[PDB]
Design a protein around this nucleic acid. Structure first.
Ligand SMILES: Cc1cn([C@H]2C[C@H](O)[C@@H](COP(=O)(O)O)O2)c(=O)[nH]c1=O
Ligand SMILES: Cc1cn([C@H]2C[C@H](O)[C@@H](COP(=O)(O)O)O2)c(=O)[nH]c1=O
Lengths: 318, 318
DNA sequence: CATAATAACAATA
DNA sequence: TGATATTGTTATTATG
DNA sequence: CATAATAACAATA
DNA sequence: TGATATTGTTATTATG
């Protein structure tokens, strides 16, 4: 295995922002930087262990989810500089108890959500707002529209989605689409990495495709295309967040605030309610239209968030 | 820790059937027996390791689920003879890869089931058959009736269930019941071990309770009460299996054969379809009425088996 | 100070 | 079954 | 042999 | 997140 190397992406990130008008110092990226530097020319595992221990010591006090995320960042640095075969990857990681506790916390929140679905009283309005967004001249708007109407993740809509007409018999589907470019997935059997699959849309397919072409040809859109998640996050996140909040403030269910993933959750719910064939289950349907891996029905549990007020009505019929 | 001991239950099982009219030899129980015997006076971990290795060697060729089950039997023997603190418990177990593969196989079967629910065309007939069973003079029949009408496991209905009237406001519920005595659960936070909880019934509560008292007072019922799972299995399983098969042969969906747990699966489905409030999810509802642990929504995935032909109809409306 | 930028901080899938 | 990649919120910073 | 008992064998939750 | 407890099927055995 190699003893020298460099996590380019980190250094570059740090070199940009050498000249910065404002903003906080890249302290963490700096720590990562010096860590990877200190690793240059280390052959002894106790040495590596000591280094990492110092890093973990610094992290203490920070939140558990924060630590798990930071550990990912270090591990990805190590991988970039030194490769997959480097003994530091066996050393630089979270305690197993930490990850286990994350799992418990998350399961508990989900179990809690499933026992108290949120009735999305005004979802019809929300969906129309999205539809109209599809016709806006502001590419951010169109993108929001498409998150709502196709359920693709922001990073997907804005950065990497390919949308196609889906053939329905010997014609073209008006309520589904072809989609390619799933995020959060690496190459693999039963994985939608690089797979084009059919997904339902909550308005006419002609409309969605056309709005997408408008998206793909705009000024902002050519810049967005092929961005890394850090680039995209930096450039849009807070603006997207503010726009979504403003656009939906008055209609969004009282129990929570309007956030962009809200649109994806609602999309699953509505798509199921309108399109699910009878031999498939809700967990299955979601996992299918959300692009989850083969045999994964557990991610689908995260998305069961609201109850459409129609279901709430007719369940209250009994 | 102790170096001597005896797994009483195994030896007794072997002493019964010293005198047996027929049936195959208790070879496996014998192997377990001699294993625990050989462990008497072992202090060296390499010795223990060798012994166990010989056992595993014998098991080879047998199925994976078989091996996992057998390993449970040995581990339970060790525990009974020598206690929880014995170093053999760190040694006598399956390879982690084996358990992992079990998990994968099972997830794959479930994901498969969720994508092809079985339409239970005649469930109404099945349920009435159960109802009528509730009035039979044959305690086996009544028990079947109650599996169908309360969804409790066979071992629960026959051996250990306590059923009570459930108070509805200042009166008594006609479509729910109190139930106590959950199987497959050890003491714990967020566990129904020793907990009485309300469950829905698929016919009038008066009827279910009365049929249960008839069950609890019959000849066979006093014998059944408090049996161990081995006793119960030995005494009833094959008769229950044959009766359920005969009773339901002509009406049970074409894709599968009538087995007793079929009744519990259908019960969940029907109970949900008739009783689930709107703010709870199907996974949640099941987990609640099946007595699953707190924050466990994953067991519920096993039970999503059929589609009621009404749902199949009205989904095909779209 | 008064904000807009930025990256830390943090949570979710 | 090892230990990520995305989406979401706020402290801290430079400069008007 | 012809079955009924039994426990091994096996799968599911 | 370690490594079970229940439900389900069949080979093998003693004896009519
Ligand atoms: C909770 C959770 C963990 N992970 C973890 C599991 C492994 O640590 C890693 C998979 O690569 O990411 C997910 O990918 N998704 C999730 O929802
Ligand atoms: C697949 C599965 C495993 N187990 C295992 C997990 C542990 O090995 C053990 C729990 O005690 O049993 C269940 O209890 N239920 C299941 O459905």
């Amino acid at each position: 295995y190699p003893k020298t190397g460099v996590a380019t992406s980190i250094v570059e990130k740090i070199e940009r922002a050498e000249f910065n008008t404002a903003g906080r110092k890249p302290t963490v990226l700096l720590r990562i930087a010096d860590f990877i530097a200190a690793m240059n020319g280390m052959d002894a595992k106790q040495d590596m262990q000591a280094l990492w221990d110092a890093e973990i010591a610094i992290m203490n006090g920070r939140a558990q989810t924060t630590i798990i995320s930071y550990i990912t960042k270090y591990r990805n640095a190590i991988r970039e500089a030194f490769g997959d075969d480097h003994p530091m990857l066996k050393i630089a990681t979270g305690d197993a108890a930490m990850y286990d506790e994350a799992r418990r916390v998350k399961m508990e929140k989900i179990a809690n959500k499933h026992g108290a679905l949120i009735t999305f009283e005004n979802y019809r309005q929300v969906l129309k707002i999205c539809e109209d967004c599809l016709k806006s001249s502001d590419p951010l708007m169109i993108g929001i529209g498409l998150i709502g109407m196709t359920g693709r993740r922001p990073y997907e809509v804005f950065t990497q989605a390919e949308f196609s007409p889906a053939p329905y018999g010997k014609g073209v589907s008006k309520w589904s689409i072809l989609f390619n470019g799933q995020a959060k997935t690496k190459q693999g059997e039963g994985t939608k990495f690089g797979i084009t699959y059919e997904i339902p849309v909550l308005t006419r397919s002609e409309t969605v495709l056309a709005a997408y072409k408008r998206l793909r040809e705009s000024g902002q859109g050519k810049l967005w295309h092929g961005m890394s998640i850090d680039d995209f996050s930096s450039e849009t996140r807070l603006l997207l967040r503010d726009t979504v909040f403003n656009l939906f403030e008055d209609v969004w269910p009282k129990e929570e605030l309007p956030k962009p993933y809200g649109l994806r959750h609602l999309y699953a719910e509505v798509a199921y309610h309108n399109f699910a064939p009878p031999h498939v289950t809700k967990n299955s349907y979601f996992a299918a239209i959300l692009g989850h891996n083969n045999n994964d029905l557990e991610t689908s549990l995260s998305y069961m968030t609201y109850t459409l007020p129609e279901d709430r009505d007719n369940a209250l019929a009994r």
